DNA sequence: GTGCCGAGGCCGCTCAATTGGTCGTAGACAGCTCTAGCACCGCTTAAACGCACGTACGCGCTGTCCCCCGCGTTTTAACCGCCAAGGGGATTACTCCCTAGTCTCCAGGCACGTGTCAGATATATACA
DNA sequence: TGTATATATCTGACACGTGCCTGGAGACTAGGGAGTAATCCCCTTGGCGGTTAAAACGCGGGGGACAGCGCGTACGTGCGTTTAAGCGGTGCTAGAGCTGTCTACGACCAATTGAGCGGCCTCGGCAC
C-alpha cells in the first residue's frame, strides 16, 4: 500500500513549508522517509493496546505513543 | 467558602491538591501550601495564551476563538515558542516566504 | 494563447495552503496504509474513527516541518530546487538518520 | 466522570476579553495545554524532594520548577503572581 | 550509606571475560547507565497503570515498557531472558 | 537463608530493586513480586551487552583493564546501541571518522 | 573577574574542530564560536543556581551539574558519583 | 627548505586528537568564564573541584558534535572551509534558539 | 626496559535482605447492555494520471583576486607542588506546629435537553 | 486572468440553565517530616615563584572561494479525459465500557543472621 500518496499530494505538502521548485525524485524519497517515521508510531500504538487486552486501537493510544517520540499533538484528549 | 475565592484565583484548589497526592510519591506529602502556588501558575499561563490569541481575532472581525489564531499567537511569539513545543491540530504553520524565491 | 511564467503559478500556492487549516493528504489512501503496517505486528486489528484523524495530523505536521529545514539547505548551497540528498542531511542533524 | 477544565478556561477569557468566544475544536487545544504543564510541574517538583532528601512538598518546590521549565522572561512574572495568592489565602 | 552497583557489575564481567578488569573511571560509566535505565523503566511503567485505571505494577508492566523504549531487535531477546527467571523463581 | 537472586539465576539484587520501586511510583500503589524478578533481568542483560562489545575491542590493544575509550567505541560504533544510549561518556572521545 | 570572554584562544578552537572532521577553518569562526558557546553555557549554569538555592546552599556541588544537564538533553556520565 | 604542502599537515591532527581522550580546552581560562556568568544570577558563589570538570566535559562534547553537522553542510554546498553562516543552519534543525 | 599510585582481595561492623503469620481490598473474569467499527449498495463531480513544448535551474570549465596554511623568533601566562586561614557542607540531638486520615453536611461540577446567531456558501461588483 | 470585498443566505453547533450526585469544604485528634540551632573538621579560595607547555605577532605563497559565460536535459504550466475520492445512506455483530462477586497474592509488623559499605594494604597494570 505504498502507492497511497500520489504525486500532487506530496507537492501540496511542500507548498506549506516554503518549497518553490520540487524535483522529480522527491516523490520517490518522500515515501521512504514517511514510512520510517510511521513505523515508530504504529508499532508503539500496538504495544499500548495489547497491555489493556484490547483489539481496537482507541483515540488515546495515538496520543500516548506520540508523546515519547517528541511530536506531541493536541486536540485529541491530550 | 471555597479555597479558590479566598486566594483570588479561578482554578480549583481542591482538584489540584487531590491530583498531586495521587501521583508521586507514597512517602511524599502535598500540603495545602503547595496547592495555592500550583493554581497560580496554571492560571497565568492560560491567560497569557488567550491574550495573544484574542488580539488577532479582532482583525478578521470574528467572535469565537478559532484554532488558526491559537497557532499564530503561540508560534509567532519568541517567548512562548520554546515553552509550547507541541503541535496544534488544524492550524498549519506561520506563512513565511524566503527572499530567494521571489 | 495565455501562459504564465514558470514561477508565478507555483508562488500563488504558497500563500493559499499556508492560510488554510484543512488536511492536504486524503483520508482513504492514508487509512489503507496504516492497516497494512499494523497487520505485521498484530493481525485482525481495528482502528477507531478518531484514531485515523490523530495519525493524519501528526504525519502532515512532520512532513511540513521537515520541508522547512530541507529547503534551507538548497538556498544555502546557491540553489532553488530541492534535492533528495538534502533530506538525509537535515535528518542527520536532528537525530533521525 | 470526565474531569476536565472546560468550565475554568472560559471564565478567565471573560475577565480579559469579554467580547470573545470559543469553539469545540479550540476547547481541546487549551485543555491539553493545561494538562501538559501540570504533568511537567508535578514531575519536576517530585525529583526535588528525592535529590535533596526530603518528602513534604510545599510552596518552595513549586517555585523552583517554574524558573527551570521557563527560559526566563516569563518566569519572573510568575513569581510575583504566585506569591500574591499565597499570602492572601493564609492572611484571611 | 552509598547504595551503588559497584559489586554487581564486576560479577557479570567475570562470567563472560574473566581475563579482563575494570577501573574507577569505567565504573562510573556503567553505574550511571543502569541508574538511567531504571529511571526510564519505572517511569514508563507508571503511566501504563494510571492511563488504564490500575494501581498494581506486576510483570506485565515491565515487559510492556521494554518494547516501547528499545527500538526493536534487542527488545525481542529481552523477552526470552526476562521470562526465564520469572518461571524459575515461582516454580522452585 | 536463600537469596532471591540465586533462585532466579540472576546477579542483580532483587530486594534492592523491589525496595526502590515502592519509594518512586506510585502513591497509593503496590509493587508486585513478579515485577522485581523481571526488572533484574533487564538491567543484567543490558549490562552484559555493553561489556561484551567492549571486552572484545580491548583485547586487541594489548591492554587488560577496561579503559573509558573502549566503552565509547562499543556504544557509538553499534547502530542499535547508539539510539538507546543517547548520553555522553566523559573521557572517551568520538569515533575516528575521516 | 572582568571580561573573561577571551579565555578561548584561537588554537583552542582548532583542537575542537579536528575531532569532528574540519579541514580548513575560516578567520571569522573564532568570532562566532565564542558567541554560540556562551549561549549554551547560559542555560546549564543558570539551571545549576536554581537547584543549589533550593537546598539552602551556597556552593555548587557536583550533583547539580548532572541534574541540570539531564533536563536540557545532554546527559553526561561519569560524574554521577 | 622542507616546507610541506598546505593540506598534508592539517590531516594529521584528525587522526591524533580523535584517538586520545584528553581535555582540549584548558582549565584556568575556562574557570574564570563560569564565574562571570554565575555572578549575575547569585553573588558570592562557589564551585567544587568536581563541579568544574563536569561543566568542561559537557562543553567539549557540545562543540565537537556541533562541528560534525557543520562540516557536512560544506560538502553539500561544494565547499571545504567552514563558515559562520553554516553554524546557524545546523542549529535551526536541532531547535537551538538565538 | 624503568618507577609510582590505583585496582583486586581480606577482615570487621551493623543496615536492611529474607521467613512466617494475619487479613485489607487490588484485580481475575463470570454475564449483560447497546456505542459506533467493518463491509458493500450507487450517483455526482473533485482531483489524479498521461503527455505537449518551450523556459530557465543545475551543471561543468576556468580566471584571478586575496582567502588563511605552514614554519619560526619572541612572548604571555598555564601546570606544577606546597603554604596558611576560615567559608559553609556534613551528620548529629530536640520539640514546634505541617498536614495525613475519619464521619458528616450540603454545594460545585457536569450529563442531557434546549433557543437562535457565529461564521460558512457562493452568488454580486471593483480592483491589484 | 488573477485574489479581496460586498450583502445576502443557510442550518450546524455555542451558550444558557435547570436536574441531581459525587467529592469540595470544615472541626477534630494522632504522630512523624524537617524547623533552625548546636557540633566537628571536609576540602574552597587566595597566597608565592620556580620551570617550560603552548599563546601571540609577523612572514611568504599555495590553493582555496565564488564572479560569470554558456552547453543541453529535467520539470513548470496547462488541455484533454482515466478511474477512484467522498457524499447520501442502510444492515450485521466485533469487542469498548459499566457494574457483580469473592478468591489470588501484596502491605504491615517483628524478631533472626547474612548481604555488602567503609577503611587497609600489596602488588602488578600500564604511564614515560
CA G7/CA G3 separation, integer angstroms:
9
Name all chains with 3 or more CB-CB pairs below 8 Å to chain E.
A, F, G
Which positions ≥6 away from D14 have C-beta within 8 Å?
A: none
CA B41/CA H95 separation, integer angstroms:
25
Enter the DSSP assignment of A5: S
CA F98/CA G18 separation, integer angstroms:
10
Residues pairing with G59 in the sheet: H46
Whether F64 CB is under 7 Å from strand I: no
In total, how many domains does chain F have?
1
At CA D55, angle to CA D54 and CA D57, rounded to 5?
105
Sign for the pseudo-dihedral over CA of D5, D11, D17, D21: positive
Q: In chain G, which residues from 25 to 54 place their CB closer than 7 Å to nucleic acid strand J?
A: none
List domains and CATH numbers for chain C: 6-97 (1.10.20.10)
Whole-angstrom CA distances from F51 to D24, F64, F70, F73, H10 are 55, 13, 10, 12, 35
CA C8/CA C56 separation, integer angstroms:
30
User: Is H45–G25 a contact, with Cβ atoms under 8 angstroms apart?
Assistant: no
Domain that holds residue A66: 1-78
CA F53/CA F73 separation, integer angstroms:
9
In total, how many domains does chain G have?
1
CA F92/CA H20 separation, integer angstroms:
8
Grid cell in block for residue E19: 581475563
CATH of the domain at A56: 1.10.20.10
User: Pick from G4, G37, G60: which is nearest to H63 by CB?
Assistant: G37
Nucleotides of I under 7 A from a protein CB: 6-8, 16-19, 26-28, 36-38, 47-49, 54-59, 67-72, 77-79, 87-91, 98-101, 108-111, 118-120
ω into F26 cis (within 30 of 0)? yes
Residues pairing with G25 in the sheet: H82
- Kind plus residue range of the DSSP H or E element containing F31: strand F30-31
Q: Which residues of D touch A77 (CB under 8 A)?
A: 28, 32
Q: Is B91 helix (H, G, I), strand (E, B) or coil?
A: coil
Helices (H), chain C: 8-12, 14-17, 28-41, 49-76, 85-94
For cell 476536565, the residue is D4
For cell 502532515, the residue is C60
Whole-angstrom CA distances from F1 to F6, F12, G16 are 11, 17, 56
Please give the full DSSP string across F26-71, using - where no structure is assigned. Answer: -SS-EE-HHHHHHHHHHHHHHHHHHHHHHHHHHTTTT--SPPHHHH
Residue pair H81/G14 in contact (Cβ under 8 Å)? The answer is no
The answer to whether residue E32 neighbours chain G at the CB level (below 8 Å) is yes
CA C92/CA D10 separation, integer angstroms:
43
User: Is B87–A72 a contact, with Cβ atoms under 8 angstroms apart?
Assistant: yes
* Region for B94 from its dihedrals, namely left if φ exceeds 0, alpha if ψ lies in -120 to 50, beta otherwise: beta
- Kind plus residue range of the DSSP H or E element containing H46: strand H46-47
Residue B89 C-alpha, separation from nearest chain C C-alpha, in angstroms: 6
Whole-angstrom CA distances from C65 to A13, C24, C78, C90, E24 are 10, 14, 22, 11, 45
**Burial environment of residue C75 by CB neighbours within 10 A (0 to 12, 13 to 18, 19 or more):** middle
Residue C34: name the closest of A60, A47, A34 by CA.
Answer: A34
Residue B102: name the closest of C15, G57, G52 by CA.
Answer: C15
Decide: A and F in contact? Rule: 3+ Cβ pairs under 8 Å: no
Residue E58: name the closest of A64, F38, B91 by CA.
Answer: F38
Q: Is G59 helix (H, G, I), strand (E, B) or coil?
A: strand
**Closest nt to residue D52, judged CA to C1':** J34
Residue H95: name the closest of H57, H58, H74, H69 by CA.
Answer: H69
**Closest nt to residue D21, judged CA to C1':** J14
CA F43/CA E9 separation, integer angstroms:
10
Enter the DSSP assignment of A40: H
Whether D25 CB is under 7 Å from strand J: yes
Whether C15 CB is under 7 Å from strand J: yes
* Region for H49 from its dihedrals, namely left if φ exceeds 0, alpha if ψ lies in -120 to 50, beta otherwise: alpha
User: Pick from B21, B22, B25: which is nearest to F24 by CB?
Assistant: B25
Q: Is D58 helix (H, G, I), strand (E, B) or coil?
A: coil
**Burial environment of residue A62 by CB neighbours within 10 A (0 to 12, 13 to 18, 19 or more):** buried
Residue D10: name the closest of D36, D34, D30 by CA.
Answer: D30
CA H98/CA D71 separation, integer angstroms:
12
Enter the DSSP assignment of B101: G
Residue B5 C-alpha, separation from nearest chain H C-alpha, in angstroms: 36
CA C82/CA C66 separation, integer angstroms:
12
Grid cell in block for residue C37: 503496517
User: Is F98–G78 a contact, with Cβ atoms under 8 angstroms apart?
Assistant: no
Decide: B and G in contact? Rule: 3+ Cβ pairs under 8 Å: no
End-to-end Cα separation, chain H, in angstroms: 48
CATH of the domain at F36: 1.10.20.10
Name all chains with 3 or more CB-CB pairs below 8 Å to chain C.
A, B, H
Residue F96: name the closest of H81, H12, H82 by CA.
Answer: H12
Q: Which residues of B touch D3 (CB under 8 A)?
A: 15
Nucleotides of J under 7 A from a protein CB: 1-4, 13-15, 23-26, 33-34, 36, 43-45, 54-56, 60, 62-66, 74-78, 84-86, 94-98, 105-107, 114-118, 125-127
Domain that holds residue F19: 1-98
Grid cell in block for residue B26: 507514597
Residue G77 C-alpha, separation from nearest chain H C-alpha, in angstroms: 9
CA D15/CA A13 separation, integer angstroms:
40
Helices (H), chain D: 9-16, 24-51, 59-69, 74-90
Grid cell in block for residue F12: 542483580
Measured in angstroms, what separates residue H53's CA from nucleotide J54's C1'? 21
Which positions ≥6 away from G11 have C-beta within 8 Å?
A: none
A43 C-beta neighbours (distance < 10 Å), count: 19
Whether G63 CB is under 7 Å from strand I: no
List domains and CATH numbers for chain D: 26-90 (1.10.20.10)
Letter string b/e over residues D55-77, b meaning 16 or more CB atoms within 10 A of that residue's CB: eebbbbbbbbbbbbbbbeeebee
Amino acid at each position: 500500500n505504498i502507492q497511497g500518496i500520489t504525486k500532487p499530494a506530496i507537492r501540496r505538502l511542500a507548498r506549506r513549508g516554503g518549497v518553490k521548485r520540487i524535483s522529480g525524485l522527491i516523490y520517490e524519497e518522500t515515501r521512504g522517509v514517511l514510512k520510517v517515521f510511521l513505523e515508530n508510531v504504529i508499532r508503539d500504538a500496538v504495544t499500548y493496546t495489547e497491555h489493556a487486552k484490547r483489539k481496537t486501537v482507541t483515540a488515546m493510544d495515538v496520543v500516548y505513543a506520540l508523546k515519547r517520540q517528541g511530536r506531541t499533538l493536541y486536540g485529541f484528549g491530550g | 467558602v471555597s479555597r479558590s475565592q479566598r486566594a483570588g484565583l479561578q482554578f480549583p484548589v481542591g482538584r489540584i491538591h487531590r491530583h498531586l497526592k495521587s501521583r508521586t510519591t507514597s512517602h511524599g506529602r502535598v500540603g495545602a501550601t503547595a496547592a495555592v502556588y500550583s493554581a497560580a501558575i496554571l492560571e497565568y499561563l492560560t491567560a497569557e495564551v488567550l491574550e495573544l490569541a484574542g488580539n488577532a481575532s479582532k482583525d478578521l472581525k470574528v467572535k469565537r476563538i478559532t484554532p488558526r489564531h491559537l497557532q499564530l499567537a503561540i508560534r509567532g511569539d519568541e517567548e512562548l515558542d520554546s515553552l509550547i513545543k507541541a503541535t496544534i491540530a488544524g492550524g498549519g504553520v506561520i506563512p513565511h516566504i524566503h527572499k530567494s524565491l521571489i | 494563447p495565455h501562459r504564465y511564467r514558470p514561477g508565478t503559478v507555483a508562488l500563488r500556492e504558497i500563500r493559499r495552503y499556508q492560510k488554510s487549516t484543512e488536511l492536504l493528504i486524503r483520508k482513504l489512501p492514508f487509512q489503507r496504509l496504516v492497516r497494512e503496517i499494523a497487520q505485521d505486528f498484530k493481525t485482525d486489528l481495528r482502528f477507531q474513527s478518531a484514531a485515523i484523524g490523530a495519525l493524519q495530523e501528526a504525519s502532515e505536521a512532520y512532513l511540513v516541518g521537515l520541508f522547512e529545514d530541507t529547503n534551507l539547505c538548497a538556498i544555502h548551497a546557491k540553489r532553488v530546487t530541492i534535492m533528495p540528498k538534502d533530506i538525509q542531511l537535515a535528518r542527520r542533524i536532528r537525530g533521525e538518520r | 466522570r470526565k474531569e476536565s477544565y472546560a468550565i475554568y478556561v472560559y471564565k478567565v477569557l471573560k475577565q480579559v476579553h469579554p467580547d470573545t468566544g470559543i469553539s469545540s475544536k479550540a476547547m481541546s487545544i487549551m485543555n491539553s495545554f493545561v494538562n501538559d504543564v501540570f504533568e511537567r510541574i508535578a514531575g519536576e517538583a517530585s525529583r526535588l524532594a528525592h535529590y535533596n532528601k526530603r518528602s513534604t512538598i510545599t510552596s518552595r518546590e513549586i517555585q523552583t520548577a517554574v524558573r527551570l521549565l521557563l527560559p526566563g522572561e516569563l518566569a519572573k512574572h510568575a513569581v510575583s503572581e504566585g506569591t500574591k495568592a499565597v499570602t492572601k489565602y493564609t492572611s484571611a
